[PDB]
């Protein structure tokens, strides 16, 4: 009796990037055995982007656009046996230059969201392709001034509006600040039927985003990062507040993302995906990797060197983990 907003006993499957074909759809759902796709609705990057500096109409306008494509792969994912997530990535105003979101600090830009959330649950009500609307990815509060909501409370009146609209998909929520998994102590269950709660896994970030923005290359996992031992059991402990706040709420949770990039030393990322995986499979957990077919950081058809940015010749450890995992699923069945 737990809300999943689903029939089947899994989801598993993968972010993909905006500029996703459909030949790649159809291979991720028909050929990987993908059941799952996270669609997220950026704005060229992330946590900085355009967005940061346009106007509402100007991001009305990309959102549209972002959108109509979205609306032309749900056809696609269908006949893939996939169902979606709407990630709205890049939110109304952005990002400040310390990557807190202008939706808690402006309120042009709080209403907006709440008015684009209704407009996306109007146009999607009756899919039946979509699984469920993934409010915000990542938010970041900083400061909240008065006579503005935060998350807890901008979450729950935007949740409330989505479900007036939409009588079957998933509300999936994730904690501020990051959508990290010690941020889920921070929510509150917001009171609206039919809510799903997600976090991102990507500790340590010295391991998984090594080599990208500041941090050095060369960390091995299993082993010793940032001072502390990591290996299964510290994954588990990290993913601890998750687990109690699924026990002791009785909802369902979603890793909307994790990863570890793909030029860690040896064997690691695959450990590092396979210990993960293995978590939320005890604690039934669906769950997408990122990403397939983005930025190749993160791509499991890559391989381990970071100068080197074409295609392995031969599957990966890392891909032929994913498709074991994918082998597990059972497909949306479709009227």
């Given at each position: 009796?737990?809300?999943?907003?689903?029939?089947?006993?899994?989801?598993?499957?993968?972010?993909?990037?905006?500029?996703?074909?459909?030949?790649?759809?159809?291979?991720?759902?028909?050929?990987?055995?993908?059941?799952?796709?996270?669609?997220?609705?950026?704005?060229?990057?992330?946590?900085?982007?355009?967005?940061?500096?346009?106007?509402?109409?100007?991001?009305?306008?990309?959102?549209?656009?972002?959108?109509?494509?979205?609306?032309?792969?749900?056809?696609?994912?269908?006949?893939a046996?996939?169902?979606?997530?709407?990630?709205?990535?890049?939110?109304?105003?952005?990002?400040?230059?310390?990557?807190?979101?202008?939706?808690?600090?402006?309120?042009?830009?709080?209403?907006?969201?709440?008015?684009?959330?209704?407009?996306?649950?109007?146009r999607?009500?009756?899919?039946?392709?979509?699984?469920?609307?993934?409010?915000?990815?990542?938010?970041?509060?900083?400061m909240?001034?008065?006579?503005?909501?935060?998350?807890?409370?901008?979450?729950?009146?935007?949740?409330?509006?989505?479900?007036?609209?939409?009588?079957?998909?998933?509300?999936?929520?994730?904690?501020?600040?990051?959508?990290?998994?010690?941020?889920?102590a921070?929510?509150?269950?917001?009171?609206v039927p039919?809510?799903?709660?997600?976090?991102?896994?990507?500790?340590?970030?010295?391991?998984?985003?090594?080599?990208?923005?500041?941090?050095?290359?060369?960390?091995?996992?299993?082993?010793?990062?940032?001072?502390?031992?990591?290996?299964?059991?510290?994954?588990?402990?990290?993913?601890?507040?998750?687990?109690?706040?699924?026990?002791?709420?009785?909802?369902?949770?979603?890793?909307?993302?994790?990863?570890?990039?793909?030029?860690?030393?040896?064997?690691?990322?695959?450990?590092?995906?396979?210990?993960?995986?293995?978590?939320?499979?005890?604690?039934?957990?669906?769950?997408?990797?990122?990403?397939?077919?983005?930025?190749?950081?993160?791509?499991?058809?890559?391989?381990?060197?970071?100068?080197?940015?074409?295609?392995?010749?031969?599957?990966?450890?890392?891909?032929?983990?994913?498709?074991?995992?994918?082998?597990?699923?059972?497909?949306?069945?479709?009227?």
């Amino acid at each position: 009796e737990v809300f999943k907003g689903h029939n089947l006993p899994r989801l598993r499957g993968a972010m993909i990037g905006p500029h996703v074909t459909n030949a790649d759809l159809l291979e991720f759902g028909n050929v990987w055995k993908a059941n799952h796709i996270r669609w997220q609705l950026i704005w060229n990057g992330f946590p900085h982007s355009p967005a940061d500096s346009a106007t509402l109409d100007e991001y009305r306008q990309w959102l549209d656009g972002a959108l109509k494509r979205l609306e032309a792969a749900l056809p696609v994912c269908r006949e893939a046996g996939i169902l979606v997530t709407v990630d709205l990535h890049t939110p109304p105003g952005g990002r400040n230059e310390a990557s807190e979101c202008r939706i808690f600090h402006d309120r042009e830009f709080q209403k907006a969201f709440i008015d684009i959330w209704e407009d996306i649950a109007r146009r999607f009500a009756d899919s039946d392709v979509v699984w469920g609307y993934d409010l915000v990815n990542e938010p970041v509060e900083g400061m909240v001034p008065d006579g503005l909501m935060n998350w807890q409370r901008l979450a729950e009146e935007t949740a409330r509006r989505v479900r007036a609209i939409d009588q079957k998909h998933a509300i999936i929520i994730e904690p501020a600040p990051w959508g990290s998994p010690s941020s889920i102590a921070l929510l509150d269950p917001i009171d609206v039927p039919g809510v799903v709660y997600s976090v991102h896994m990507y500790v340590p970030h010295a391991f998984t985003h090594q080599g990208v923005y500041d941090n050095p290359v060369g960390i091995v996992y299993p082993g010793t990062i940032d001072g502390k031992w990591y290996d299964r059991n510290t994954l588990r402990k990290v993913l601890e507040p998750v687990r109690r706040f699924q026990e002791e709420n009785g909802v369902h949770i979603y890793i909307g993302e994790f990863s570890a990039i793909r030029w860690a030393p040896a064997d690691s990322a695959c450990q590092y995906l396979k210990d993960c995986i293995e978590i939320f499979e005890e604690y039934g957990w669906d769950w997408a990797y990122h990403a397939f077919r983005e930025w190749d950081g993160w791509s499991v058809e890559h391989g381990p060197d970071r100068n080197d940015r074409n295609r392995t010749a031969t599957p990966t450890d890392r891909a032929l983990l994913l498709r074991s995992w994918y082998a597990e699923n059972v497909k949306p069945q479709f009227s």
